[PDB]
C-alpha cells in the first residue's frame, strides 16, 4: 500500500527521505517503524522530506513509515499546569500521564483584526525598572533582548513568581497562567529552574515546555508552537496567559539547521527565506481578545541573545521588528552594580503607558522624565539633575526572586521622585529602601491596601504617603 505507507530511501543528519506516502499532507506527523515520529516538511515529486523527532542511529534505509492523517497537534488544557512536558506534550517530570482532554494544532492562524481590542490592563512584572519605565500590558509582545548572562531568564522568572499574589487572590480576571518554553537550554538549568519555581509555589499555575540541547532540531523548532498552543487555549477561554520563549535565537538556529539539511535555499547567515515568517506567525498569536470573544489574552515575552550587543543581526532584526517593544540588558550596566541591568535609554514599550496603573502612571511619568534629562546631561543647577539621576538610578536596583507588589513599588518610587532622598547621598538609598519597605509593610497596611483597591494616589493617601516617608526619614540612620 504505497499511498498511506512509505519506505525510507535515505537518512542522514536528521532528514529522512521517504519514498511513497502518496497521500500525506504537508506538515503531517508520520510514524516511523521504531516508534519515533516525524513531520512531512517537504513534499517532492519523488520522495517526502521528513524531519525526525529523534535520532538517526535507530532508523535505517528501508524502514516503514505510516501516516496518522492529522497535522501536528499537542494536548492543551488545565491538566498541564504544574507539569513539565517536552515539545510534543509528553510528560517528562515522571509524575505520570497528562490527563488532558483537548488537543489543538500547533500551526494555527493568529486571531484577526476584529477579534482584538487595545492592550489596556497591566501585566505586573514585579520589577521596578520594568513596571516603571517599560510597562507591559496583557496582550503585548515585549522582547527581552541582551547578550549572554545579563539577567533575561531572571526577569522571566521574577514575572512568573510575581503572578502568585494574583493567582492566590479572588479576582478571576486578574489571574495569569504562565508558560515557560526552554529551547536549547541545558537540562540542568531547566531542572534548577523548575525547582526555583516549585519552592516559590509557582508551579501550580505554570507549564514548562522543554526542548533542551540534547533534543532533535525538529523538537527545538516545534517547542515554541506547542507552548503557544497551550497558551492560546487559555486565551480563547476568557483566561489570561503569559508565555516566555527562552530563547528564540536557538529556535531559529534549529530551524536553520533543519532547512539547510532539507536543501532549502539559504539566505543571510544561511537562514531560510521564511525565517522571519517563522517568528512572526508565532509572535502574532499573542493577542488581547475583545469581550465578544471571551476577553482573554496571551502575553509573550520572547528572549533574544545577541552577540556583542549587535541588535541588527538577522534574527534580532526580525524579532525587534515583530514585537511591541524590548527590554535591553547590558553587561556593562550589569557590572556597574545596576541590577536588573536594564538600559532604559534603549528599552521601549509602545503599548506601555496605556497598560500602567494610574498610581504608577503618576509616579513613573516624573521618574522617566527625570531619568531622561539626567541621561541627556550625563553648575548649581545641572548637578542637581545629576544628583536626582543618581538617587533614581539607585532606586531601580532590585534583588533576584523577590518581586514587589505594585503599591510597594509606587511607594518607593514616590519617596524617590518627590525629593525626599535628596538628603541622602548615593550609597545609602539601598539600605533606606529595604528599611523603608519594611516600615510601610508592617505599620501601614491600610495605605497600601486602598492604594491597591483604588489604583491611584488620591489626595488623602498622597498626604499619608508624604507624612509617612518624612517621618521614616527623620528617624533613619
Amino acid at each position: 500500500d504505497l499511498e498511506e505507507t512509505g519506505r525510507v530511501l535515505s537518512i542522514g543528519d536528521g532528514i529522512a527521505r521517504v519514498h511513497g506516502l502518496r497521500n500525506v499532507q504537508a506538515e503531517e506527523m508520520v510514524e516511523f517503524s521504531s516508534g519515533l515520529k516525524g513531520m512531512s516538511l517537504n513534499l517532492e515529486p519523488d520522495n517526502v522530506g521528513v524531519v525526525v523527532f529523534g535520532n538517526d542511529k535507530l532508523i535505517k534505509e528501508g524502514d516503514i513509515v505510516k501516516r496518522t492523517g492529522a497535522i501536528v497537534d499537542v494536548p492543551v488544557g488545565e491538566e498541564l499546569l504544574g507539569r513539565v512536558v517536552d515539545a510534543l506534550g509528553n510528560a517528562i517530570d515522571g509524575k505520570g500521564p497528562i490527563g488532558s482532554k483537548t488537543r489543538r494544532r500547533v500551526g494555527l492562524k493568529a486571531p484577526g483584526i476584529i477579534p482584538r481590542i487595545s492592550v489596556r490592563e497591566p501585566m505586573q512584572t514585579g520589577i521596578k525598572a520594568v513596571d516603571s519605565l517599560v510597562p507591559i500590558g496583557r496582550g503585548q509582545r515585549e522582547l527581552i533582548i541582551g547578550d549572554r548572562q545579563t539577567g533575561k531568564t531572571s526577569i522571566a522568572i521574577d514575572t512568573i513568581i510575581n503572578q502568585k499574589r494574583f493567582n492566590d487572590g479572588s479576582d478571576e480576571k486578574k489571574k495569569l497562567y504562565c508558560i515557560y518554553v526552554a529551547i536549547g537550554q541545558k537540562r540542568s538549568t531547566v531542572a534548577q529552574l523548575v525547582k526555583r519555581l516549585t519552592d516559590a509555589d509557582a508551579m501550580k499555575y505554570t507549564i514548562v515546555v522543554s526542548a533542551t540541547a540534547s533534543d532533535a532540531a525538529p523538537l527545538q523548532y516545534l517547542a515554541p508552537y506547542s507552548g503557544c498552543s497551550m497558551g492560546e487555549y487559555f486565551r480563547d477561554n476568557g483566561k489570561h496567559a503569559l508565555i516566555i520563549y527562552d530563547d528564540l535565537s536557538k529556535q531559529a538556529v534549529a530551524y536553520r539547521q533543519m532547512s539547510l539539511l532539507l536543501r532549502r535555499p539559504p539566505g543571510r547567515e544561511a537562514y531560510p527565506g521564511d525565517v522571519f515568517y517563522l517568528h512572526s506567525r508565532l509572535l502574532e498569536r499573542a493577542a488581547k481578545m475583545n469581550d465578544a470573544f471571551g476577553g482573554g489574552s496571551l502575553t509573550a515575552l520572547p528572549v533574544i541573545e545577541t552577540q556583542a550587543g549587535d541588535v541588527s543581526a538577522y534574527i534580532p532584526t526580525n524579532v525587534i521588528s515583530i514585537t511591541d517593544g524590548q527590554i535591553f540588558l547590558e553587561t556593562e550596566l550589569f557590572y556597574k552594580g545596576i541590577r536588573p541591568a536594564i538600559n532604559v535609554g534603549l528599552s521601549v514599550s509602545r503599548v506601555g503607558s496605556a497598560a500602567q496603573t494610574r498610581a504608577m502612571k503618576q509616579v513613573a511619568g516624573t521618574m522617566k522624565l527625570e531619568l531622561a534629562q539626567y541621561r541627556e546631561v550625563a553648575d548649581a543647577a545641572t548637578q542637581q539633575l545629576l544628583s536626582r539621576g543618581v538617587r533614581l538610578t539607585e532606586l531601580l536596583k532590585q534583588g533576584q526572586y523577590s518581586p514587589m507588589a505594585i503599591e510597594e513599588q509606587v511607594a518607593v518610587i514616590y519617596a524617590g521622585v518627590r525629593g525626599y532622598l535628596d538628603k541622602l547621598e548615593p550609597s545609602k538609598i539601598t539600605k533606606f529602601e529595604n528599611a523603608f519597605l519594611s516600615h510601610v509593610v508592617s505599620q501601614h497596611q491600610a495605605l497600601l491596601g486602598t492604594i491597591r483597591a483604588d489604583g491611584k494616589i488620591s489626595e488623602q493617601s498622597d498626604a499619608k504617603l508624604k507624612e509617612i516617608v518624612t517621618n521614616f526619614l527623620a528617624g533613619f540612620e
Partner: protein, 53 residues
C-alpha cells in the same frame, strides 16, 4: 590671564568636539560600508558553497 584662558579653553574644546564629530560621521560611513561588504562576502561564500553540490 585667568580670563583669556577659560575663553581659549572653551573655544578650543568647541573645535575639538566639532572635529571629533566630523571624524565620527566619516568613520560611521566607512563602518556601514564595511558591514555591507561583510554581509555580501559571507552570502557569496554560502551561495558558492551551495552551488558545488
Amino acid at each position: 590671564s585667568t580670563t583669556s584662558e577659560q575663553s581659549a579653553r572653551m573655544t578650543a574644546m568647541d573645535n575639538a568636539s566639532k572635529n571629533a564629530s566630523e571624524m565620527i560621521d566619516k568613520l560611521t560611513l566607512t563602518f556601514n560600508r564595511t558591514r555591507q561588504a561583510v554581509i555580501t562576502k559571507e552570502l557569496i561564500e554560502i551561495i558558492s558553497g551551495a552551488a558545488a553540490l
